[PDB]
Amino acid sequence: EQETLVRPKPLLLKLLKSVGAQKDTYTMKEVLFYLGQYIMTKRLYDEKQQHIVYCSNDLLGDLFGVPSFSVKEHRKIYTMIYRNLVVV
Amino acid sequence: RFMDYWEGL
């Protein structure tokens, strides 16, 4: 169907494990959900403009390869996430 | 409201 099964690379797995359960494979939906929770728990967003995330000083910044991004940049977020996993 | 925006992905 439309569901996507994935296997996160080492660093993304570390990211995911800090807020969720360890699994051999995850769905893209699960990954997106956990990343949101990770960003929230670490308060990486701007309190006064919460659709803006600054990740340069965080593991997420190392994974995505950018200092910051807007939650509205869907293509960017999806492509950056795909660059950190393998589709099964 | 971060979640409101994140829900859009």
From Swiss-Prot, chain A:
Source species, domain of life: Eukaryota
SWIB/MDM2 domain location: 4-87
Modification after translation (UniProt): Phosphorylated at multiple sites near the RING domain by ATM upon DNA damage; this promotes its ubiquitination and degradation, preventing p53/TP53 degradation.
Residues covered by region (Sufficient to promote the mitochondrial pathway of apoptosis): 1-79
Tissue expression notes: Ubiquitous. Isoform Mdm2-A, isoform Mdm2-B, isoform Mdm2-C, isoform Mdm2-D, isoform Mdm2-E, isoform Mdm2-F and isoform Mdm2-G are observed in a range of cancers but absent in normal tissues.
Residue ranges, annotated region (Necessary for interaction with USP2): 1-88
Induction field: By DNA damage.
Compartments where found: Nucleus, Nucleoplasm; Cytoplasm; Nucleus, Nucleolus; Nucleus
UniProt free text on domains: Region I is sufficient for binding p53 and inhibiting its G1 arrest and apoptosis functions. It also binds p73 and E2F1. Region II contains most of a central acidic region required for interaction with ribosomal protein L5 and a putative C4-type zinc finger. The RING finger domain which coordinates two molecules of zinc interacts specifically with RNA whether or not zinc is present and mediates the heterooligomerization with MDM4. It is also essential for its ubiquitin ligase E3 activity toward p53 and itself.
Record's subunit section: Interacts with p53/TP53, TP73/p73, RBL5 and RP11. Binds specifically to RNA. Can interact with RB1, E1A-associated protein EP300 and the E2F1 transcription factor. Forms a ternary complex with p53/TP53 and WWOX. Interacts with CDKN2AIP, RFWD3, USP7, PYHIN1, and RBBP6. Interacts with ARRB1 and ARRB2. Interacts with PSMA3. Found in a trimeric complex with MDM2, MDM4 and USP2. Interacts with USP2 (via N-terminus and C-terminus). Interacts with MDM4. Part of a complex with MDM2, DAXX, RASSF1 and USP7. Part of a complex with DAXX, MDM2 and USP7. Interacts directly with DAXX and USP7.
Biological role: E3 ubiquitin-protein ligase that mediates ubiquitination of p53/TP53, leading to its degradation by the proteasome. Inhibits p53/TP53- and p73/TP73-mediated cell cycle arrest and apoptosis by binding its transcriptional activation domain. Also acts as a ubiquitin ligase E3 toward itself and ARRB1. Permits the nuclear export of p53/TP53. Promotes proteasome-dependent ubiquitin-independent degradation of retinoblastoma RB1 protein. Inhibits DAXX-mediated apoptosis by inducing its ubiquitination and degradation. Component of the TRIM28/KAP1-MDM2-p53/TP53 complex involved in stabilizing p53/TP53.
Disorder this protein is connected to according to its UniProt record: Seems to be amplified in certain tumors (including soft tissue sarcomas, osteosarcomas and gliomas). A higher frequency of splice variants lacking p53 binding domain sequences was found in late-stage and high-grade ovarian and bladder carcinomas. Four of the splice variants show loss of p53 binding.
Note: MDM2 RING finger mutations that failed to ubiquitinate p53 in vitro did not target p53 for degradation when expressed in cells.
Similarity comment: Belongs to the MDM2/MDM4 family.
Name of this protein: E3 ubiquitin-protein ligase Mdm2
Organism (species): Homo sapiens (Human)
Gene: MDM2
